[PDB]
CRISPR system Cms protein Csm5
Amino acid sequence: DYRTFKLSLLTLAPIHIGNGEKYTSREFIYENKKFYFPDMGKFYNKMV
RNA sequence: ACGGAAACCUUGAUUCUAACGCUACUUCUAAAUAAGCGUUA
């Protein structure tokens, strides 16, 4: 009594779904032609 | 020097045996972390 469909989604453009949170500029590094988002806990552990 | 004297209403006995506060029941129902970019330059 159940019908199952498969929906294949091909993005034709950028698609953003947020969670309400935002990276601040004190949280990512722009270098080597890339944006690096480190883990803040790991960064702090290496910085202590 | 009294129809009086002497004489335990006393001994032994478990208010005990058996028995599920149990049977059935979805913390469930819909819901894009999303909308607006004006005016000046």
User: Anything to note?
Assistant: Residues 17-20 of chain A lie near RNA strand B (CB under 10 Å from a C1'). The CA atoms of residues 8 and 17 of chain A lie 18 Å apart. The helical segments of chain A are 40-47. The longest strand of chain A covers residues 29-31.
